[PDB]
C-alpha cells in the first residue's frame with residue numbers, strides 16, 4: 402500500500418509507514434512536516450506544501466477487514482481396539498472303558 406498523507410517510508414520493504422517527525426528549527430521550536438502526496442518519502446514542512454490539506458481529493462481507504470478465525474482443535478482419536486475374546490472350553494478327557 403502507498404504510505405498515506407503525512408506518512409513516509411524510505412527503506413524499501415518496510416512493514417509499517419512512519420509519520421513525518423516535527424522539524425526542529427533550533428532553539429526549541431518545531432514546525433511539523435506534512436507529505437505532499439501519497440507514497441512519498443519526503444517530509445516537506447506543512448507551511449510550504451504546494452497542495453494544501455484542503456486540496457486533497459482522495460477518498461480515505463476503507464478500514465482493515467476482520468482477522469480470520471482460529472484453527473479447530475485436534476479431532477478425537479478412534480476408539481481403542483478390544484481385547485481377544487475368551488478361548489472356548491477345552492475337551493473333556495475320554496470316558497472310561
Ligand SMILES: *[C@H]1O[C@H](CO)[C@H](O)[C@H](O)[C@H]1O
Pocket residue numbers: 406457459460461462
Ligand atoms: C482520509 O485519507 C484521505 C487521503 O486518501 C484524506 O486525507 C481524507 O481527508 C482523510 O479523511
Ligand SMILES: *[C@H]1O[C@H](CO)[C@H](O)[C@H](O)[C@H]1O
Pocket residue numbers: 463464465466467
Ligand atoms: C472487509 O471490509 C473491507 C471494507 O472495510 C472490504 O470490503 C474488504 O473486501 C472486506 O473483506
Ligand SMILES: *[C@H]1O[C@H](CO)[C@H](O)[C@H](O)[C@H]1O
Pocket residue numbers: 465466467468469
Ligand atoms: C488481524 O488481521 C487484520 C487484517 O485482516 C488486522 O490486521 C488485525 O489488526 C489483525 O489482528
Ligand SMILES: *[C@H]1O[C@H](CO)[C@H](O)[C@H](O)[C@H]1O
Pocket residue numbers: 473474475476477
Ligand atoms: C474432527 O473434529 C474437529 C473439530 O472438533 C474438526 O472438525 C476436524 O476437522 C475433525 O476431523
Ligand SMILES: *[C@H]1O[C@H](CO)[C@H](O)[C@H](O)[C@H]1O
Pocket residue numbers: 478479480481482
Ligand atoms: C487405544 O487405541 C486408540 C487408537 O485406536 C488410541 O490410541 C487410544 O489412546 C488408546 O487407548
Ligand SMILES: *[C@H]1O[C@H](CO)[C@H](O)[C@H](O)[C@H]1O
Pocket residue numbers: 483484485486487
Ligand atoms: C469376544 O469378546 C471381545 C470383547 O469382550 C470382543 O467383543 C470380540 O469381538 C468377541 O469375539
Ligand SMILES: *[C@H]1O[C@H](CO)[C@H](O)[C@H](O)[C@H]1O
Pocket residue numbers: 488489490491492
Ligand atoms: C484346552 O484346549 C482349548 C482349545 O483346544 C484351549 O486352548 C484351552 O485354553 C485349553 O485349556
Ligand SMILES: *[C@H]1O[C@H](CO)[C@H](O)[C@H](O)[C@H]1O
Pocket residue numbers: 493494495496497
Ligand atoms: C464319560 O466321561 C467323559 C468325561 O469324563 C465324558 O463326559 C463322556 O461324555 C462320558 O461318556
